[PDB]
Amino acid sequence: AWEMGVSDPRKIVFSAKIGLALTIVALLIFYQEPNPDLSRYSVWAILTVVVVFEFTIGATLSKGFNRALGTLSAGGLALGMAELSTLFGDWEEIFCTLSIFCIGFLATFMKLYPSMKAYEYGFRVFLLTYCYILISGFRTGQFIEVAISRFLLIALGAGVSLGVNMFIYPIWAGEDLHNLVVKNFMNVATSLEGCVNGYLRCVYKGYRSAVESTSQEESLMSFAIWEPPHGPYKSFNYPWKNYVKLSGALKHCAFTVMALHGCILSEIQAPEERRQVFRQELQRVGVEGAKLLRELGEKVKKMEKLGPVDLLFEVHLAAEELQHKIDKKSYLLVNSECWEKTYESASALSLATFASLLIEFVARLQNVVDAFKELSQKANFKEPE
Amino acid sequence: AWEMGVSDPRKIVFSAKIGLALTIVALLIFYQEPNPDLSRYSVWAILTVVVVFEFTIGATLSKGFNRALGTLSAGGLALGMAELSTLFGDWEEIFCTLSIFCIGFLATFMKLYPSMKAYEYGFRVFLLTYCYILISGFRTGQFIEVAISRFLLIALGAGVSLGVNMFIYPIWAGEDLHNLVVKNFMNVATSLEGCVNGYLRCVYKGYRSAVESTSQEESLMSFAIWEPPHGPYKSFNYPWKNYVKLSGALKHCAFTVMALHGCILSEIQAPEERRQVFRQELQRVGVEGAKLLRELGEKVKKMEKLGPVDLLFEVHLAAEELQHKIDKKSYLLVNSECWEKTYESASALSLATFASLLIEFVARLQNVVDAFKELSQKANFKEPE
Ligand SMILES: CCCCCCCCCCCCCCCC(=O)OC[C@H](COP(=O)(O)O)OC(=O)CCCCCCCCCCCCCCC
Ligand SMILES: CCCCCCCCCCCCCCCC(=O)O
Ligand SMILES: CCCCCCCCCCCCCCCC(=O)O
Ligand SMILES: CCCCCCCCCC
C-alpha cells in the first residue's frame, strides 16, 4: 500500500531494481541476433533472473553458490549415467527408470535430515537437473552441446542479476544486524517504563522483539560473512559474533521484564492502597534503568567507547534506597498474629514479588556492560570526546 | 540415516512414494506411440511431480489450488496484453518491455507485504508464467493453442501425483495436531515436576515446546480444513479451532512455569537451611499439579468426557495447606528489628517469590478445565465407561 511504501522506501527500490533487470534481459532478447532457436534459449535468462535476485548481497552469493553446486553435480551424474546405460543395450529404458527411482529416493531421504532442513532449495534443483537431463537426451542421443549451451545463458542471467543488485544501491546484512542491535535497546527501555507505570497506575512488542529475534540475528550473521569490506566495516574478518553476544546478554535481562509484565495480568493482586506506599522508589528505579539502556543504545549506534565515569552508580543507589524502604515497612507484607483468609494473604504477599523482580533486573545489568566493553575492544571503536 | 529410518518408518514410505510417482510418469513418457513427434513437451509432466508433492494431503490440495490460481490469472493477463499489443504495430518491443517492467514491480511489491508472507510460492508462479508466455508467444499466432497443451501435461502430472499421494499411506494433518496437543500436556507436566524438584536439591524444553508451537498449531489447522472426513473425525465441519483454544489456555499456564525456572538461574538466592522448612508443601503441590495435567492429557488422547468427580479438589487443598504454612513461619522472610546487610535481606525476600508463583500457577488451572469442557461438548466425546 501507499502507507507501506512511504514508511519504507527500501522496498520500492528493490522492486524497481528487479523490474530493471527483467527489462534489460527482455530488451536484449527482443533486439538480439535473429538466429534460429531464439525463442528456445531466450527465456532461460529472463527466468533465472527471477530465481537468483535476493534481498541482500550475501544471501544472493550463498544461494547462488549452493545452486551452482547442485546443478553441476546433478549434470555430471546425469551424463555419467547416460553413458553407463549403453552397456545394457537390451535393457535401456528399464535401467534409466530404475536410476530415476534410486536417485529420487536418495535425494528425498537426504533432504529430510534435521541438520539439512535449510538447504532444500538445492536438493530440488538437483532433482530437477537430473530428471531434465535424463529425459531430454533419449530420443536423439549425444545430448551434450545443448546442455553446455543452456548454462551459458543461465550464467548470463545470473551475471546481470549480480551486477544490477551489487552496483545500484546495495543492501548489506551487516548494517541490518547493526541496526537491529541498536533497536532492541530502545524496545526494552520502553517496555520497562511501561510496566512500572502500568503497575502504579491508579509493553509487549518491546520484549517480544528482543526475545523472538534470536534466529534473525543468526541468519543475518550467516549472510554477512560473504560480503566484502565497505564503509566503516574495513577489516579482513569483522567480529560479527560480538554483536550476537551482546544481544544474548540483553535477552537475559529482558526475561525479567517479561515476568514483570506477567505480574500485572495475574488473577491474584494486592490492594491499590498498599501499592502507593512504595511509589517513589519504583519510579526512580525505572527511570534510571531506562536512562542507562538508552545511553548504551546511543553509544552502540555511534561506535563510541565508554567514558571514565561509572554508568551504574545511580541505579545501584536507587536499588539500595528501595531495599531500605522495603525493610522499614515490611509489616505490610505479612502478618504477626499467626506467628509460631488465603486470598488476602496472597494479595499482600504478591507485592514483594514485584519488588524482588525489580531488584533482580537491576542486578543483571553488569553482564550487558561487560559484553559492551568486550565488543568495543574487539572492534576498534572510537574514543569519546 | 538408518536410525532416522528405524525410529521413523514414515520418512521411508514418503520417499518410496515419490520415487514410485516419478517412475510411473517416466514409464509413460518412455513407452509412447511409435510416432514421437506427436509430442515433444513431455518433461512438463515429469517436472510437476517434483513440485506438487507435500508431506500431508491437505497441504498438497491447498498449494495446488494456490498455484493454479496464479497460473491461470497470469496466462489470461499475458494473452490480453498480447492481443492489445498489435494495435501499436510500429512499437511492439517497447510496449512489451514496458509491460514486463510494470508486472515485475507490482509482483515484487505485493509479495513483500508482511500479511501475505505465507503465500510466497503463489506469487512467483504468476511472474514466471507472464514472462514465459509473453517472450515465447512473440511472433506467433498459435500460442493460445500451445498454452492448453502445456497445461494439459501439467494436469496429467498433478493428477498422477494426487492419486499416488492420497491412495497409498495418507498422512493427515488433523492427526498431527491431535497428537501435538497431548505431547504439549505431557511436556508441561514434566517441566513442572522438574522445576519443583530442582529448586529443593541439596525442565527446559518442556515449556519451550508448548510456548513456541503456535505457528505449527495454526498451519496444521489451516491444512486440516481441506481434508475430507476419515476415521474418528467424521463431520463436515470439525471444530479444529477448539484445539487451538485449549492449547492457548495451556500456554498461559506454561508462562508461570517459565517464571519459576527463571528463579533457579538468578544471581540472588536464599540459603538452603531456610528452603528446607517448606519442602513438604511445595512437593505435594507439584505432585498434584503434574497428576492433574497428565489426567487431562490422557482424556484428550482417548476422546472421552470428564467424569462426575471434582478434579481440582486435591490441588486446591494442597495450596491452602501451603498458604497456612507460609502464614505460620512468616518471620523467616522479613526482619522485625527495624520495623517502623542488604544482600541477606534480598536473599530472604526471594524465598517468597517462588511460593507466590506456585500459588499463581495453581490459580490458573480453572481456565484450562473450562476450555477442555467446551471442546468436549463441541465435539461429541464419548461418555466415560
Ligand atoms: C528452467 C530455467 C530457469 C530456472 C528455473 C528455476 C528452477 C528452480 C526451481 C523453481 C521451480 C521450477 C522452475 C520453473 C521455471 C518455468 O519455466 O516455469 C514457469 C511456469 C511454471 O512455474 P513454476 O515451476 O514455478 O511452478 O510454467 C508455466 O506456467 C507455463 C504454462 C503455460 C501457461 C498457460 C496457462 C493456461 C491459461 C489458458 C488461457 C485462459 C486463462 C483464463 C484467465 C481468466
Ligand atoms: C529447473 C531446471 C533447470 C535446468 C536444469 C538442466 C540444466 C542443464 C545444465 C547443465 C549444467 C552443467 C553440467 C556439467 C556437467 C559436466 O560437465 O560434468
Ligand atoms: C519446464 C519448467 C517448468 C515445468 C513445469 C513445472 C511445474 C509447474 C506447476 C504449475 C502449478 C500447477 C499446479 C496446479 C496443477 C493442477 O491444478 O492440476
Ligand atoms: C535455476 C538455477 C540456476 C543455478 C545457477 C545459479 C547461478 C550460477 C550460474 C553459474
PDB file of N, CA and C and ligand atoms in Angstrom, chain A residues 132, chain B residues 43-44 47-48 51-52 63-65 67-68 71 125 151 154-155 158-159, ligand 3:
ATOM      1  N   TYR A 132      15.575 -33.605 -15.862  1.00  0.00           N
ATOM      2  CA  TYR A 132      15.512 -32.943 -17.158  1.00  0.00           C
ATOM      3  C   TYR A 132      16.574 -33.485 -18.100  1.00  0.00           C
TER       4      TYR A 132
ATOM      5  N   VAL B  43       8.521 -33.254 -20.729  1.00  0.00           N
ATOM      6  CA  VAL B  43       9.158 -33.049 -19.437  1.00  0.00           C
ATOM      7  C   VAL B  43       8.283 -32.199 -18.533  1.00  0.00           C
ATOM      8  N   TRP B  44       7.307 -31.494 -19.111  1.00  0.00           N
ATOM      9  CA  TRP B  44       6.391 -30.692 -18.312  1.00  0.00           C
ATOM     10  C   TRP B  44       5.570 -31.570 -17.380  1.00  0.00           C
ATOM     11  N   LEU B  47       8.213 -32.765 -14.442  1.00  0.00           N
ATOM     12  CA  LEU B  47       8.660 -31.733 -13.514  1.00  0.00           C
ATOM     13  C   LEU B  47       7.556 -31.214 -12.598  1.00  0.00           C
ATOM     14  N   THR B  48       6.293 -31.578 -12.836  1.00  0.00           N
ATOM     15  CA  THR B  48       5.220 -31.203 -11.917  1.00  0.00           C
ATOM     16  C   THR B  48       5.198 -32.076 -10.666  1.00  0.00           C
ATOM     17  N   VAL B  51       7.247 -30.846  -7.866  1.00  0.00           N
ATOM     18  CA  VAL B  51       6.804 -29.563  -7.331  1.00  0.00           C
ATOM     19  C   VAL B  51       5.464 -29.640  -6.611  1.00  0.00           C
ATOM     20  N   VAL B  52       4.724 -30.742  -6.725  1.00  0.00           N
ATOM     21  CA  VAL B  52       3.415 -30.805  -6.086  1.00  0.00           C
ATOM     22  C   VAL B  52       3.290 -31.997  -5.133  1.00  0.00           C
ATOM     23  N   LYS B  63      -1.895 -26.051  -1.689  1.00  0.00           N
ATOM     24  CA  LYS B  63      -0.848 -25.474  -2.517  1.00  0.00           C
ATOM     25  C   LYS B  63      -1.164 -25.631  -3.999  1.00  0.00           C
ATOM     26  N   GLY B  64      -1.750 -26.763  -4.403  1.00  0.00           N
ATOM     27  CA  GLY B  64      -2.129 -26.908  -5.798  1.00  0.00           C
ATOM     28  C   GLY B  64      -3.192 -25.912  -6.220  1.00  0.00           C
ATOM     29  N   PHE B  65      -4.153 -25.630  -5.334  1.00  0.00           N
ATOM     30  CA  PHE B  65      -5.148 -24.615  -5.672  1.00  0.00           C
ATOM     31  C   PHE B  65      -4.507 -23.233  -5.791  1.00  0.00           C
ATOM     32  N   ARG B  67      -1.469 -22.530  -6.615  1.00  0.00           N
ATOM     33  CA  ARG B  67      -0.626 -22.445  -7.806  1.00  0.00           C
ATOM     34  C   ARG B  67      -1.454 -22.335  -9.082  1.00  0.00           C
ATOM     35  N   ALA B  68      -2.597 -23.022  -9.138  1.00  0.00           N
ATOM     36  CA  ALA B  68      -3.417 -22.911 -10.338  1.00  0.00           C
ATOM     37  C   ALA B  68      -4.090 -21.550 -10.431  1.00  0.00           C
ATOM     38  N   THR B  71      -1.341 -19.309 -11.999  1.00  0.00           N
ATOM     39  CA  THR B  71      -1.026 -19.663 -13.377  1.00  0.00           C
ATOM     40  C   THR B  71      -2.138 -19.227 -14.326  1.00  0.00           C
ATOM     41  N   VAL B 125       4.906 -17.980  -9.291  1.00  0.00           N
ATOM     42  CA  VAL B 125       4.305 -18.641 -10.443  1.00  0.00           C
ATOM     43  C   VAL B 125       3.697 -17.611 -11.383  1.00  0.00           C
ATOM     44  N   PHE B 151      -0.670 -26.853 -20.217  1.00  0.00           N
ATOM     45  CA  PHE B 151      -1.462 -27.072 -19.015  1.00  0.00           C
ATOM     46  C   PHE B 151      -2.111 -28.448 -18.991  1.00  0.00           C
ATOM     47  N   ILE B 154       0.679 -30.490 -17.466  1.00  0.00           N
ATOM     48  CA  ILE B 154       0.766 -30.183 -16.043  1.00  0.00           C
ATOM     49  C   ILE B 154      -0.406 -30.803 -15.289  1.00  0.00           C
ATOM     50  N   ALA B 155      -1.574 -30.893 -15.930  1.00  0.00           N
ATOM     51  CA  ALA B 155      -2.715 -31.541 -15.298  1.00  0.00           C
ATOM     52  C   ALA B 155      -2.509 -33.045 -15.184  1.00  0.00           C
ATOM     53  N   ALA B 158      -0.128 -33.570 -12.254  1.00  0.00           N
ATOM     54  CA  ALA B 158      -0.724 -33.311 -10.948  1.00  0.00           C
ATOM     55  C   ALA B 158      -1.762 -34.365 -10.583  1.00  0.00           C
ATOM     56  N   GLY B 159      -2.470 -34.915 -11.571  1.00  0.00           N
ATOM     57  CA  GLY B 159      -3.414 -35.978 -11.275  1.00  0.00           C
ATOM     58  C   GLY B 159      -2.725 -37.247 -10.819  1.00  0.00           C
TER      59      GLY B 159
HETATM   60  C1  LIG C   3       9.917 -26.713 -17.778  1.00  0.00           C
HETATM   61  C2  LIG C   3       9.963 -25.913 -16.478  1.00  0.00           C
HETATM   62  C3  LIG C   3       8.600 -25.886 -15.785  1.00  0.00           C
HETATM   63  C4  LIG C   3       7.930 -27.261 -15.767  1.00  0.00           C
HETATM   64  C5  LIG C   3       6.593 -27.175 -15.035  1.00  0.00           C
HETATM   65  C6  LIG C   3       6.838 -27.029 -13.536  1.00  0.00           C
HETATM   66  C7  LIG C   3       5.540 -27.275 -12.774  1.00  0.00           C
HETATM   67  C8  LIG C   3       4.604 -26.080 -12.914  1.00  0.00           C
HETATM   68  C9  LIG C   3       3.471 -26.242 -11.907  1.00  0.00           C
HETATM   69  C10 LIG C   3       2.498 -25.071 -12.018  1.00  0.00           C
HETATM   70  C11 LIG C   3       1.471 -25.173 -10.895  1.00  0.00           C
HETATM   71  C12 LIG C   3       0.344 -26.129 -11.279  1.00  0.00           C
HETATM   72  C13 LIG C   3      -0.291 -26.669 -10.002  1.00  0.00           C
HETATM   73  C14 LIG C   3      -1.778 -26.941 -10.201  1.00  0.00           C
HETATM   74  C15 LIG C   3      -1.998 -28.019 -11.254  1.00  0.00           C
HETATM   75  C16 LIG C   3      -3.439 -28.509 -11.137  1.00  0.00           C
HETATM   76  O1  LIG C   3      -4.299 -27.789 -10.570  1.00  0.00           O
HETATM   77  O2  LIG C   3      -3.770 -29.632 -11.595  1.00  0.00           O
END
